Amino acid sequence: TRDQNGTWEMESNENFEGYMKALDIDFATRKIAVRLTQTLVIDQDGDNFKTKTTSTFRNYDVDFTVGVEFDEYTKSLDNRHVKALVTWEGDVLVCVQKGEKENRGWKKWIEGDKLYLELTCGDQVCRQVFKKK
Ligand SMILES: *C/C=C(C)/C=C/C=C(C)/C=C/C1=C(C)CCCC1(C)C
């Protein structure tokens, strides 16, 4: 399925520390962030996505249209400018964030009632799994 609508509660989070370190997120922020349960709310209408990731400590909102390049300033993360593009490869939603960091982006897909999110930066891969609330 390409339908990723839902309120998604984080079930697991593998190597978030490595990914954040590759992004140059400071030590203290990384230590807080690795322990937190995230909720990812996705509102998807055709090719329009509105997403909100929340935790007790920090939130991050990003909206995008599939197939439309957009400028991103990663405020509240690593505070960089990237040129972002989100597209479909089969039923995998693929984001490439072009800029200073190599191999920067993510892949998101559904597999039997779980949402999988693989975040990449440099040589690091973070693997997250969510379940619908
Ligand atoms: C569709 C999947 C998306 C938009 C993935 C979003 C991932 C985040 C918003 C993660 C954000 C964070 C970090 C990268 C490190 C600091 C903690 C967070 C949760 C603000």
The ligand 1 site (C-beta within 6 Å) comprises 20, 25, 33, 38, 51, 53, 55, 58, 60, 62, 77, 108, 117
- For residue 9, the one-letter residue type is E
With helix as H, strand as E and coil as C, how does 26-47 read? CHHHHHHHCCCCCEEEEEEECC
Experimental method: X-ray
CATH of domain 1-133: 2.40.128.20
**Calculated CA dihedral for residues 122, 106, 51, 33, nearest 10 degrees:** -40
With helix as H, strand as E and coil as C, how does the chain read? CCCCCEEEEEEEEECHHHHHHHCCCCHHHHHHHCCCCCEEEEEEECCEEEEEEECCCCCEEEEEECCCCEEEECCCCCCCEEEEEEEEECCEEEEEEECCCCCCEEEEEEECCEEEEEEEECCEEEEEEEEEC
Residue entry with tokens 């690091």:
124
Q: What are the beta bridge partners of residue 13?
A: 128
Which of 15, 47, 53, 64 has the most ligand 1 atoms within 8 A of CB, as the residue to mutate?
53
CB-based contact 131:7 (threshold 8 Å): no
- 107 C-alpha to ligand 1 centroid (Å): 13
User: Which tokens hold the place of 46?
Assistant: 């055709």
User: Which tokens hold the place of 95?
Assistant: 């984001």
- For residue 96, the one-letter residue type is V
The widest CA-to-CA distance across the chain, in whole angstroms, is: 39
